Amino acid sequence: SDADVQKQIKHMMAFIEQEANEKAEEIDAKAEEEFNIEKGRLVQTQRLKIMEYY
C-alpha cells in the first residue's frame, strides 16, 4: 500500500531529523565547554607569568 508506506516513512524519518539536530546541540555543548576550558587555560598561564614578573 503506497499510502501506508508514505505515512510510515513520514513518521520514521523524524528520528533522523532529530539526530541531525542533536549532533549540532552536542557540538554547541562542546563549544560552551571549550570556551570555559580555553579561557581558564589562557588566564591562569598569563596570571602566573605576570605574578612571577612582579
Binding site: M13, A20, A24, A31, F35, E38, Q46, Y54
Partner: protein, 57 residues
Amino acid sequence: SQSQGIQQLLQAEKRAAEKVSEARKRKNRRLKQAKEEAQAEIEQYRLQREKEFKAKE
C-alpha cells in the same frame, strides 16, 4: 517520479547541514570570545600586582 522519495531523504540531510554549519560557526565565535574575556581578566590581575608592587616600594 523517484524525486518524491529522494527529496524526503534529502530533507533530513539538509537539516543536518544547516544545524551543524551554525554550530561550527558558534564554536569559532566562542573560541574568539573566550580569548577576548581572558585578555580583560589578565589586565585586572596585572593592575592588582602593580598596586601591590608600588606599595612594597
